Amino acid sequence: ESRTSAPSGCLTVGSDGTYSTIGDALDALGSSTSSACIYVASGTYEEQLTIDYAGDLTLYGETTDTSTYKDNVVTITHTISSPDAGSLDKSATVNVVSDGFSMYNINVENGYGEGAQAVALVGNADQLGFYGCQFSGYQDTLYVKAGTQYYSNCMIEGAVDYIFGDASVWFGECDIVSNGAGAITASSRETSSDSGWYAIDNCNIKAASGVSLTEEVYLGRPWRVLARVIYQNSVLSDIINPKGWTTMADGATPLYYEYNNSGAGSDTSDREYETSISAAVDKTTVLGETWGDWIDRSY
Numbered sequence: 147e148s149r150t151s152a153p154s155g156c157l158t159v160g161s162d163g164t165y166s167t168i169g170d171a172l173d174a175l176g177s178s179t180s181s182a183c184i185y186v187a188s189g190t191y192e193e194q195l196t197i198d199y200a201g202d203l204t205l206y207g208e209t210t211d212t213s214t215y216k217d218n219v220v221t222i223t224h225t226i227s228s229p230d231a232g233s234l235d236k237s238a239t240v241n242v243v244s245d246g247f248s249m250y251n252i253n254v255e256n257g258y259g260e261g262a263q264a265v266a267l268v269g270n271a272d273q274l275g276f277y278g279c280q281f282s283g284y285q286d287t288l289y290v291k292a293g294t295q296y297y298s299n300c301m302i303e304g305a306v307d308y309i310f311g312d313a314s315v316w317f318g319e320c321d322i323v324s325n326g327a328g329a330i331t332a333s334s335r336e337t338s339s340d341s342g343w344y345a346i347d348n349c350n351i352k353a354a355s356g357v358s359l360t361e362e363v364y365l366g367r368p369w370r371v372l373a374r375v376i377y378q379n380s381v382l383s384d385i386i387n388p389k390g391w392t393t394m395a396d397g398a399t400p401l402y403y404e405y406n407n408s409g410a411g412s413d414t415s416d417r418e419y420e421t422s423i424s425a426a427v428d429k430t431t432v433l434g435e436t437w438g439d440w441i442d443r444s445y
């Protein structure tokens with residue numbers, strides 16, 4: 147589908163919309179628990195946002211093709227590092243603390259670059275769905291902090307711990323793009339009672355164009371001692387170090403898995419820190435039995 151005007155009932159943001167900024171449309175929602183939506187027309191929006199709406203909010207970006215992130219024309223950008231902002235969350239260009247939030251075809255970036263942690267988006271709520279979005283940074287790009295989250299046909303770009311936190315999160319058909327040496331995931335799963343996983347499924351892991359990172363990228367390292375991550379049914383380019391995984395938390399006992407991956411970085415013979423698994427995990431394991439209620443199936 148093309149989405150070139152506001153879907154039914156949505157507030158409009160843009161040069162020729164009701165609101166000039168995304169923040170103004172968010173503010174206009176006020177204190178309601180009704181479901182709502184906002185359509186954002188093409189543009190670069192220099193804004194830092196907290197999504198804390200009480201109801202179920204959907205944020206749609208304009209695009210000629212909703213099925214991909216590649217034609218996105220809406221970018222939300224802001225630049226600050228966590229040392230300057232005061233916390234990881236306060237560094238985020240977009241901070242999602244509203245359950246049931248969905249975002250379609252929007253690009254989110256932190257323009258800080260290499261040198262310190264600078265979050266593009268923090269997901270800190272349950273039943274979060276992201277479809278055809280881009281998330282760009284260097285260190286700590288995508289803070290999957292907590293809650294059940296689903297990313298489909300997204301582009302996640304970074305270098306150092308650029309998917310990190312304790313969300314239970316499923317990445318499907320995403321392009322995961324390294325723009326520097328480092329570990330892709332940094333799960334903070336920390337106790338046995340924590341039922342969370344990161345699952346990277348039918349994804350494509352590769353270098354950013356123009357950057358040579360042969361064997362300089364790790365699938366992950368453990369931010370806390372019980373980090374749990376599986377890469378399955380995915381393509382891994384030659385960026386992946388033969389060891390696969392590296393270290394971080396002292397005394398870590400990570401649960402790190404690979405299943406049915408292909409590509410030049412998919413040879414497992416020299417891996418370290420892995421555990422055997424005989425089948426891929428499913429979304430019921432990662433997100434719970436109710437995932438069919440909130441995930442956009444039609445997408």
Ligand SMILES: [Cl-]
Nearest residue numbers: 235270291292
């Ligand atoms: Cl919190």
